[PDB]
């Protein structure tokens, strides 16, 4: 008979703060604010004086 169109939806998504809402259930996300560091001085390519 017919077709439909659509998109993709993950069953457990991420909530982002848009411009006119708070907590919008979005499929995917990234994280502009990196919280996890490497707790050492990554110093290859330099001569490094502790």
């Amino acid at each position: 008979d017919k077709i439909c169109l659509g998109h993709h939806a993950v069953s457990n998504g991420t909530k982002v703060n848009t411009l006119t809402e708070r907590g919008v259930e979005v499929v995917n996300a990234t994280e502009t604010v990196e919280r996890t560091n490497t707790p050492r001085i990554c110093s290859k390519g330099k001569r490094t004086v502790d």
Binding site: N17, T18, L19, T20, E21, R22
Partner: protein, 148 residues
Amino acid sequence: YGFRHQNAQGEGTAADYKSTQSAIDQITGKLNRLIAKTNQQFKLIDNEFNEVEKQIGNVINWTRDSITEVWSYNAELLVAMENQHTIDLADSEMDKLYERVKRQLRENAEEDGTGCFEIFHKCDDDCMASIRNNTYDHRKYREEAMQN
């Protein structure tokens, strides 16, 4: 957003709840994101009554008027971005209202392009109230519409 209609029983400006409150909540969210508090407390870095240092007062005034030109450019750009966005999200649910009407009356239809309607028949206000219910149906005399 609203409606207005013309038939044999009368006329008069209707209204609709669905996309109205959607429009008011998107700007209220746009309000409450922006109508909000800067949580950071800014201290008092320069004096008002006696004798701040000449160079660092010029540095602070260079810094503050930069930051003033930073935020006022931001405030002018933000509001003008949000104004253009608000008129974008005001004009958007014209399309979201007007075409979800046109994909229901569609086999009756020719079109004029005013923001309005046309028909093959004449029915009462049971039709036009159901347009605001999103609950219109057509299938019962398409076999007569080809005669029209």
